[PDB]
């Protein structure tokens, strides 16, 4: 709920470049400034002879929102011989996937084609470039001597990537072995130390790779998506990967051991062609230090109230348990054909309540396919099934849908305000948007009505001016608040009380406030963080018995408190927000004594 949607940071790239197809954070290992990494896989480059080679842009923060390309490779195509190119970089989609860990940045071109040295071919093996700092090396683990579709010639290595916490790479190649797909994992140390530009197929020791299997597994697309997380409690991140054509289009998700690529766990979809496995994510969502698996099936069809199938998408949440099992739950999309679940982004603890949170994108929902992103907060039982926030794209396109939410990245506190922030790409409008998380104020409110029971016959209070004898009682409302992260010391609260709120339009209200002789009482207030329970008392009374003949329904004393957000701003311009999970209304009720 605490993401700032009023003034996000908006970044654009060249028209038609698919700027925003992939997004990440960059946190260099010098406690330096932080940047955004945005993939623009159809962008034109200065590489001689290359058309739409793609690029990865580094975008500054709070310095006029400027992006400059990262020079991974300035060169065009190498030649095997005169007029015989060794490789083909045009339309290679460099920047389709970008991942960064500390100093290192990994970006891949899943449609890079390579000729091979024996014959004239154009095999989309894919290639990646790894920039560790001053040094940049190529990393094309599928550009091997295992040629052709039956080998790794159509592997499209780099289709999906990730880093393990121990600086291993996880690479997905959905085309290997007649589209069985393949996962490959190499130590970054190997990737840079074994790099020799004179050798096109590099022998990395300690490489982990899935193996060719029986033909029945063809056309499964292993490596369509990947995530990492420990799932046998040995501290070594394991490999999660979506396999969306597996099990005759039901889809599957494989988990392999991050130490030997042994198979650990499997998930299987429930519906034909729901594209189960289009996206995967691993994050502890319920605060037990056991990573939990999220699997998106964007084309999943639901049964509607009328019994008609309706394509809304579905995400499954699998809570890891020490016993090795998983505790699975399903989450359904909201709009037809919106493809809820195309992207799943761990957010970290967005609201800093103790449980991590997650964003799930519906890139084709909203008005005129503008796209929608749903925020789901975690809790000890799992994921909160009702989204606490709804982000909506703001741009339309005249060619391809904006696809706001197609890519997302969170879990990085870019502005150092104490809460992680979210990047959302919208490649159909060549846009990427950073949403900063506002801080959260938790408020403890108490309301006391004494005496609880009211006797009409008992009158001890005098009315304002020159009037006498009204049955009275005391209403005391109290307020206390605190917050985490950069916050103002003083907070301006506005409180309102309503006596006998039960009685709606056209019905008599039996209780009135002494001074005001009205059933409502407003009150501005001011409380400081971590301060004491600043209270305030006022006195109410009852109407003459002659005016109301309902003495049976209780008299509820309703209290509301809200905040004016403009006054609490920061140097960032970031107003704090009230904790949405604690209700901002409280009510007690008094009763008329009967005889």
């Amino acid at each position: 709920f605490n993401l700032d949607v009023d003034s996000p940071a908006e970044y654009s790239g060249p028209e038609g470049s698919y700027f925003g197809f992939a997004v990440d954070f960059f946190v260099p290992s010098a406690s330096s400034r932080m940047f955004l990494l945005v993939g623009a896989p159809k962008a034109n480059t200065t590489q001689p002879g290359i058309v739409e080679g793609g690029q990865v842009l580094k975008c500054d923060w709070s310095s006029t929102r400027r992006c400059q390309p990262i020079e991974f490779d300035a060169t065009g195509n190498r030649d095997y011989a005169k007029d015989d190119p060794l490789e083909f970089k045009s339309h290679q989609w460099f920047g389709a996937s970008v991942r960064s860990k500390q100093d290192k940045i990994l970006a891949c071109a899943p449609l890079y084609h390579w000729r091979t040295e024996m014959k004239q071919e154009r095999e989309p093996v894919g290639t990646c470039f790894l920039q560790d700092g001053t040094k940049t090396v190529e990393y094309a683990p599928c550009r091997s001597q295992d040629i052709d579709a039956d080998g790794q010639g159509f592997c499209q290595g780099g289709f999906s990537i990730d880093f393990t916490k121990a600086d291993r790479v996880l690479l997905g190649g959905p085309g290997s072995f007649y589209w069985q797909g393949q996962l490959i994992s190499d130590q970054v140390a190997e990737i840079v130390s074994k790099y020799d530009p004179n050798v096109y197929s590099i022998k990395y020791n300690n490489q982990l790779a899935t193996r060719t299997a029986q033909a029945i597994f063809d056309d499964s697309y292993l490596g369509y998506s990947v995530a990492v997380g420990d799932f046998n409690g040995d501290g070594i991140d394991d490999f999660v990967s979506g396999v969306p054509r597996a099990a005759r289009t039901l889809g599957m998700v494989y988990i392999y051991d991050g130490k030997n690529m042994s198979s650990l766990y499997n998930f299987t979809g429930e519906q034909m062609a729901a594209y189960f496995g289009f996206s995967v994510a691993a994050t502890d969502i319920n605060g037990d230090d056991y990573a939990d698996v999220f699997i998106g099936a964007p084309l999943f069809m639901d049964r509607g109230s009328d019994g008609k199938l309706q394509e809304v998408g579905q995400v499954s949440v699998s809570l890891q348990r020490a016993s090795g099992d998983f505790q699975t739950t399903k989450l359904n999309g909201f709009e037809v054909f919106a493809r809820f679940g195309s992207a799943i982004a761990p957010l970290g603890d967005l609201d800093q309540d103790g449980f991590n949170d997650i964003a799930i994108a519906a890139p084709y929902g909203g008005e005129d396919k503008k796209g929608i992103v749903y925020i789901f907060n975690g809790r000890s039982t799992g994921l909160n099934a009702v989204p606490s926030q709804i982000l909506e794209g703001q741009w339309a396109a005249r060619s391809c849908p904006p696809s706001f939410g197609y890519s997302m990245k969170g879990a990085t506190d870019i502005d150092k305000n104490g809460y992680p922030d979210l990047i959302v790409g919208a490649f159909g409008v060549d846009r990427a948007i950073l949403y900063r998380a506002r801080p959260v104020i938790t408020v403890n409110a108490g309301l006391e009505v004494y005496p609880s029971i009211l006797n009409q016959d008992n009158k001890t209070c005098s009315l304002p001016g020159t009037a006498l004898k009204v049955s009275c009682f005391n209403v005391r409302f109290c307020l206390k608040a605190d917050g985490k992260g950069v916050l103002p010391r003083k907070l301006n609260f506005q409180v309102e009380l309503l006596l006998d709120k039960l009685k709606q339009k056209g019905a008599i209200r039996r209780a009135l406030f002494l001074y005001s002789r009205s059933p409502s009482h407003s009150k501005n207030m001011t409380i400081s963080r971590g301060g004491l329970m600043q209270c305030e008392e006022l006195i109410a009374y009852l109407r003459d018995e002659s005016e109301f003949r309902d003495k049976l329904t209780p008299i509820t004393i309703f209290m509301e408190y809200r905040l004016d957000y403009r006054t609490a701003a920061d140097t960032t311009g970031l107003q704090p927000i009230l904790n949405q999970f604690t209700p901002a209304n409280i009510s007690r009720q008094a009763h008329i004594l009967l005889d």
């Epitope: 001597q145 295992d146 039956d150 004179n198 197929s201 022998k203 490489q207």
Partner: antibody
């Protein structure tokens, strides 16, 4: 830390067959071709051919077409060669060598001597 | 098939000397020539590939040059452990073919 370990010396009578192994370690055995080289005592290096371990496809020098058949067990990262119809002219050291690319073989086994006598 | 020929089958050299080993191909092999060292005990190493590319792990003393049909390996500052036999090998066309070799022995 690439290493190719070849099986021990082989003795076979004339007309028999032998089969030697070459176990790879330190790289992904499936992603690289394995070559085979013949060297007679005091003589030079002769090229037999190569195998694509993941597909079983092979190409041979015309000399050794009928004489040698190459195979590969990917589960054990082992390439095998079998010599058949053995003569005294087959007595030699037989090397396995991984394929670097660029028309070169970057790592060599220690060789397996084959002696053919009665 | 391409015939490779190392005209000198053997040569002598003292420590520190520069040894230049020659190799010639019957046809143009488009700079696809490699050099291998074989030691007395049968050990074989790759030294140079694609005419002038140094294989990882081998010392900078070894270097290779050439084009078209004529190529040469060069040992600068001959080390004791360089006493060996050196073969050239074209990789431009199948079948791969070697030169006869050139033995290097210490002068005495």
């Amino acid at each position: 830390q690439v290493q190719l370990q070849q099986s021990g010396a082989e003795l076979a009578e004339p007309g028999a067959s032998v089969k030697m192994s070459c176990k790879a370690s330190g790289y992904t055995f499936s992603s690289f071709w394995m070559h085979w080289v013949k060297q007679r005592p005091g003589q030079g290096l002769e090229w037999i051919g190569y195998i694509n371990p993941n597909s079983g496809y092979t190409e041979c020098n015309e000399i050794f077409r009928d004489k040698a058949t190459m195979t590969a067990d990917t589960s054990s990262s082992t390439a095998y060669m079998q010599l058949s119809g053995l003569t005294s002219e087959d007595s030699a050291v037989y090397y396995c060598a991984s394929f670097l690319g660029r028309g070169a073989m970057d790592y060599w086994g220690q060789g397996t001597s084959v002696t053919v006598s009665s | 098939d391409i015939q490779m020929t190392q005209t000198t089958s053997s040569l002598s050299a003292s420590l520190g000397d520069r040894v230049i080993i020659s190799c010639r191909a019957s046809q143009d092999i488009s700079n696809y020539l490699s050099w291998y060292q074989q030691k007395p005990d049968g050990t074989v190493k790759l030294l140079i590939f694609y005419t002038s590319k140094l294989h990882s792990g081998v010392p900078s003393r070894f270097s290779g040059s050439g084009s078209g049909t004529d190529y040469s390996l060069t040992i600068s500052n001959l080390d004791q452990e360089d006493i060996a036999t050196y073969f050239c090998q074209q990789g431009n066309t199948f079948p791969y073919t070697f030169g006869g070799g050139t033995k290097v022995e210490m002068r005495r």
